[PDB]
Amino acid sequence: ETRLNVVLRGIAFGARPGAVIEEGGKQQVYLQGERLDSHNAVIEEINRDHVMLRYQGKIERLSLA
Amino acid sequence: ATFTANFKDTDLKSFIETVGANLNKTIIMGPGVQGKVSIRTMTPLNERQYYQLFLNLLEAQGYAVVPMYIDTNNDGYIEGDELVLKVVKSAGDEMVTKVVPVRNVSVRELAPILRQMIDSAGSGNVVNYDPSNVIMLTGRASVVERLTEVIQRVDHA
Ligand SMILES: [Ca+2]
Ligand SMILES: [Cl-]
């Protein structure tokens, strides 16, 4: 699991997926390969019920709240 | 090709922006789009059904979607993949959405029953009849479960 203080609020999965991730009470939409805005973290995979992050050269899971 | 989705307490504007990305479509937002969206796909949806979900969830919030055909290359052809959308002000409680196939009957035959149930269930609950003979249900899970059982009973009866 991710140790980053960010909350996964929504996940829409398909051929063109997207996640809504919150940080500091602000919600923001991310596509795969995009960087997290708050931390230097890359949404490497958007899967059905979770996101996999690349943070400081490690893959970490961010699950739904 | 299908869409699954799970949204809990998501800003309307961020929901809207996600559907746009999923569908590969520019969505233009009127002023003062605000609110909260929650939904979970109990079954996958195809592009039409997902767009219908969209329409359904915005409507619940008091927001209408208006499609616009814009010719960005002055060629005299506006291809389906280039439609723009404008948004504007017009446990058993979980918001869920489900697709129910109907194997033995025309789906429109079931309308006057489901009409009665939805009137009774109250707002937020919506039935959509797909031309491929499947019924799509959006609403509170308890209600979606009671519609699913009535659909299926009539089907196999
Ligand atoms: Ca054109
Ligand atoms: Cl035009």
Numbering used by the authors:
A (entry chain C): 122 to 186
B (entry chain D): 3 to 70, 699 to 713, 74 to 80, 99 to 165
Task: Reproduce, without paraphrasing, sentences from the article in which this PDB structure was first reported.
Many Gram-negative bacteria use a multi-protein type II secretion system (T2SS) to secrete a wide variety of exoproteins from the periplasm into the extra-cellular milieu. The T2SSs are composed of 12 to 15 different proteins that form three distinct subassemblies: (i) the inner membrane platform consisting of multiple copies each of GspC, GspF, GspL and GspM with an associated cytoplasmic secretion ATPase; (ii) the pseudopilus, a filamentous arrangement of multiple copies of five different pseudopilins; and (iii) a large, pore-forming outer membrane complex, mainly consisting of the secretin GspD. The inner membrane protein GspC consists of several domains: a short N-terminal cytoplasmic domain that is followed by the single transmembrane helix, a Pro-rich linker, the so-called homology region (HR) domain in the periplasm, a second linker and a C-terminal domain.
The LBT to GspDN0-N1 facilitated crystal growth and the resultant crystals of the binary GspCHR–GspDN0-N1 complex diffracted to better than 2.7 Å resolution, with the LBT engaged in multiple crystal contacts. In its folded structure as seen in the complex with GspDN0-N1, the distribution of charges on the surface of GspCHR is quite uneven with the main hydrophobic surface interacting with GspDN0. A total of 18 residues from GspCHR and 19 residues from GspDN0 engage in a combination of hydrophobic interactions and hydrogen bonds. The first three β strands of GspCHR and the first β strand plus the subsequent helix α1 of GspDN0 are the major contributors to the interface. The interface and relative orientation of the N0 and N1 subdomains, however, is essentially the same in the two structures despite the binding of either Nb7 or the presence of the LBT insertion into the N0 domain: the superposition of the two N0 domains results in an r.m.s. deviation of 0.49 Å for 72 Cα pairs.
